[PDB]
Design a protein around this ligand. Sequence first.
Ligand SMILES: *[C@](O)(C(=O)NCc1ccccc1)[C@H](C[C@@H]1CCNC1=O)NC(=O)[C@H](CC1CC1)n1cccc(NC(=O)OC(C)(C)C)c1=O
Ligand SMILES: *[C@](O)(C(=O)NCc1ccccc1)[C@H](C[C@@H]1CCNC1=O)NC(=O)[C@H](CC1CC1)n1cccc(NC(=O)OC(C)(C)C)c1=O
Ligand SMILES: [Cl-]
Lengths: 305, 305
Amino acid sequence: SGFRKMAFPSGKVEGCMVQVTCGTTTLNGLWLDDVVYCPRHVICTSEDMLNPNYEDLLIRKSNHNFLVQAGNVQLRVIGHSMQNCVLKLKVDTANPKTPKYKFVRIQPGQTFSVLACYNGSPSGVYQCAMRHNFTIKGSFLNGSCGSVGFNIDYDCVSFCYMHHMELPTGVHAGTDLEGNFYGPFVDRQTAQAAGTDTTITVNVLAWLYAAVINGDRWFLNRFTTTLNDFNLVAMKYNYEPLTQDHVDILGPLSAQTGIAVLDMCASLKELLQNGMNGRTILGSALLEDEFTPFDVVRQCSGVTF
Amino acid sequence: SGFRKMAFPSGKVEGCMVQVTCGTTTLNGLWLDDVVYCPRHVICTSEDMLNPNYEDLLIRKSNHNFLVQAGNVQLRVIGHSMQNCVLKLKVDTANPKTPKYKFVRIQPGQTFSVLACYNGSPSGVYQCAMRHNFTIKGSFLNGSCGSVGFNIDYDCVSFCYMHHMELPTGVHAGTDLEGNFYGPFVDRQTAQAAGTDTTITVNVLAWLYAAVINGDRWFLNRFTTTLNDFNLVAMKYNYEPLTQDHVDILGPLSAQTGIAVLDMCASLKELLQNGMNGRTILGSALLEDEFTPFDVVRQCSGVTF
Ligand SMILES: *[C@](O)(C(=O)NCc1ccccc1)[C@H](C[C@@H]1CCNC1=O)NC(=O)[C@H](CC1CC1)n1cccc(NC(=O)OC(C)(C)C)c1=O
Ligand SMILES: *[C@](O)(C(=O)NCc1ccccc1)[C@H](C[C@@H]1CCNC1=O)NC(=O)[C@H](CC1CC1)n1cccc(NC(=O)OC(C)(C)C)c1=O
Ligand SMILES: [Cl-]
């Protein structure tokens, strides 16, 4: 038993991290086959960060201006092109450690692991969730750009995130691996504000089920509710409206415990209205919303990679 | 910016996980150079778990009774022995992925990452801390035995923990890599109690420092305290006595923030007596005690491996 915020093992991804330098800017890149992916703002100086014309800067660069470093070895850049906000450096060597991989765009409420890197080497691994305002709550310092987020299914790594920027509230924003930002963000040094976020209700419900699976059951009551009466309360607390698709997604966890989803909604409704009265659930004093229903099933059943 | 519960990158350890089977029992092993380490109770049946005579059980086995599998390739066992509660299986092949490594024994209050495995393949990675009752609060299912806990310093892997068993409150117990249990636990299926645990005061203070570094300041107040008056308060709330060694250890974090340690102690003291008033600190509604002072500095400075 037990239930922890659990990251995917990062080995398959560590073997893909390199260091990309362009003039005096250094950040991380992702080396897959014979292409290195990194944020296009590697070609900027600190000066032209206010309003950079990336296409214009790129036409002034040559292949030898991009220094790519895998560990201690220099890779040789033989081509480059720009795709939205990512740079793609063709190098003359295919990464022998390249895993099976896809580039995917996740939806708000989905989770992934982050391998935080500096100078092409790994610092730490952690979980976070794509929020409804298209930010994430990560831990990123200077030089962390180009670190990636990913999921692993069997042996295939699904790359979903590449880090680009921090926002005023201490949250973070990035692109998919096609260079498209999540949310209304751009890679410029202008004032950008995240936007208002909601609690991922379907994840809170999943986590309560995880709690039941682990014997934490003080919060269960004998009541039921409807989607309407629940969403009335949920809206007051800035929780995302629960849909029947959400109820269906919670099906597997509902059957494993024998607690109908609307019965669990009645427990969440009471938790939201009465607080937690100084108590905890799975060692937490607040309601956790960064475990997907898949996360719970994965951790509570023992799936490996 | 941001502060997360962060695990060490797990690549170096992933290359060491193998699958060890003996009869109908399968668990995980750690393959370093030409030796595989795993819990000795891989040799028990479900029957003889009440009071296993391991020496008697071991002498009945030969090398070819130990099925060891690194990924999909079968290893050849050419010797075996027992050292306390770990089994050492000598194989004819040195693990080509062996990292630089040490075996260390961690002390209560230190942290490490756990690479949880099933059937010899890595499933997820998470941080936890050795509790003063010699338990950890992990996430372990049937078949996770043989999973190891570890820290990384630059390039060296320090193996500190191998998983063995679950205890009454849903917590976990294991050995170091010489097979010596942490705490008053034995590898038998008998009534064993963890013992009473305390909150790791020096870690709470370190995390309060991380909060200030990351812009969370509302808990700083106009007070100071002394070690003696603080320890009067901590004892009531089942916190570990704070020592002068603890004060000195928090020194670097104290200098980085310009908040004297005894001033931060006065902030913890008021938090303990009056709670948090519906506010949070680093997105947590309770006081976190599983970041050591070293974890905080390391995460906030960007140290890589
Ligand atoms: C990113 O470029 C990086 O990791 N490394 C490049 C680098 C910078 C400095 C020294 C060596 C190498 C950084 C990562 C940021 C910095 C701290 N935490 C992060 O996530 N990304 C940016 O600097 C980013 C570049 C923009 C997208 C093109 N950037 C520039 C200017 C402002 C901000 N945001 C900001 O000012 O934050 C607030 C909270 C509003 C003060 C920004 O993210
Ligand atoms: C460990 O052996 C393992 O991971 N795999 C062997 C295996 C078991 C079942 C099916 C296939 C393979 C487990 C790990 C445990 C199991 C679930 N969560 C864990 O952390 N260790 C044991 O099962 C352990 C073996 C004992 C040390 C020699 N064991 C056996 C019987 C009972 C318990 N604990 C227990 O009863 O918990 C309480 C809370 C007291 C009810 C036990 O840990
Ligand atoms: Cl063989």
